[PDB]
Amino acid sequence: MNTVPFTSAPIEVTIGIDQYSFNVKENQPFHGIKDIPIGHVHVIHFQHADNSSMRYGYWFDCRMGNFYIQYDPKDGLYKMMEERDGAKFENIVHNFKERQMMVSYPKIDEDDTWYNLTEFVQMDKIRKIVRKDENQFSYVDSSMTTVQENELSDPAHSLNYTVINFKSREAIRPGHEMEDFLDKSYYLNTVMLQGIFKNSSNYFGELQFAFLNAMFFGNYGSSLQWHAMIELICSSATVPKHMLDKLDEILYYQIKTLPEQYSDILLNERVWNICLYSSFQKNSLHNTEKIMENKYPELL
């Protein structure tokens, strides 16, 4: 189990670690998060008490390095940094654990929620969507735009999600206009899966990462990408059975975890009604249909 120490907490802040969150008071003796489960990516995220503007955070994998958080009073935020000195890092973590200055990652043994939400998410794919090659961890915030949003403006601070556009030459073969527009299977299977993603695991990883950035940061572009990647599958007549079954599991856990009070900002009525009740795959998402009808029947 790995550890992210904090130098200090000089400003009052809500700290998220994956689906959990804790309030830290201004100059509270808080020195980080221990017992972080090895074998998953994680996200450590912030919302300042005195300025709920910019949610922001860091995706990381403790297998890739020793990471800590330090507040920068010039840029006004909590920054992730890598500690290259192993013995220093161990000595810092030991002192703070001994003094019980760390919160414990509060994982219930029966509880697969985080694995269910990140099954296909890999740090190496995150670092291609969020381009900052000098760090092993990835910064995301509420306001970062996507490459797609930027086309319709600082390219360095952008989310490089795969562009999906149903009315584009990429999506529509000349001579198969009606066919490709009404049945997106070409675009899903040839262009996106065989061509760009190479396999369904990479496509689902990006879909899962988009959802998590939408939920944890209120990142609007991320929400758009998540819905586009659901719609592309649901609007395809020909989808491998394993992919449909896997998508139903992915969506079920995403809808299960979504805060009830964010459903009005995080869920697109048109896409969900189309996907569950009109699309080729309307009868293929039984678990997701059941949780949506029981938790959010107003949206439908």
Binding site: K167, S168, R169, I172, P174, E177, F181
Partner: protein, 237 residues
Amino acid sequence: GAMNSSNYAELFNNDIKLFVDDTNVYRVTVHKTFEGNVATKAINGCIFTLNPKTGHLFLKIIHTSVWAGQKRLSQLAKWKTAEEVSALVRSLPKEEQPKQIIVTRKAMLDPLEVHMLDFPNIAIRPTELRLPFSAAMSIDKLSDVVMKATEPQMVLFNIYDDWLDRISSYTAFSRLTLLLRALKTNEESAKMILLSDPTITIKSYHLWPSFTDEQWITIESQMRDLILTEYGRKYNV
């Protein structure tokens, strides 16, 4: 975006534009079968593609053979219309290609946008105008070429005859919409208005009779009277 009463003069500026009306592409008669079920029988249709500035009408005749063995014909009709408008644009020299295509029905927007992806600078727009282009098949010479067709055919017409020698395109379009609205509202009464005086004929090379300027004023008044008479009959007003 959408074309309305505000931006009406835009129709007659020097930017090439076409109206596309798909209401006569898929045409059927509905009848009982021997077993007492109901069946449709398609009849020849047409795409009505009009330049409102010049009067040039690109009448693509849709022969019933295009429906043979096809499903969801009302859906397919929109995509066939978009395919044929796209093909017409590609057939035209660059300097004759439209800068805008205005569809009369919003259901044509996606089909036409998708067929015209290779022309990102041609705007595809809806209209808030209620245009009576469905009544094209009340113009005897247009109905005749559509019904006689034994294969897909494009026929070119000038729907204003020689009117632009005497009137502006604004006035010619107003005259056309009034005649088509009258033919849509009471076809038999409108044709009687147009044909009742045997001394005024239709030239071999025209669609409409050879009215003098004073006779067009009379005819236009008779058409407005017809439309108002029919509104009173409809609403008991």
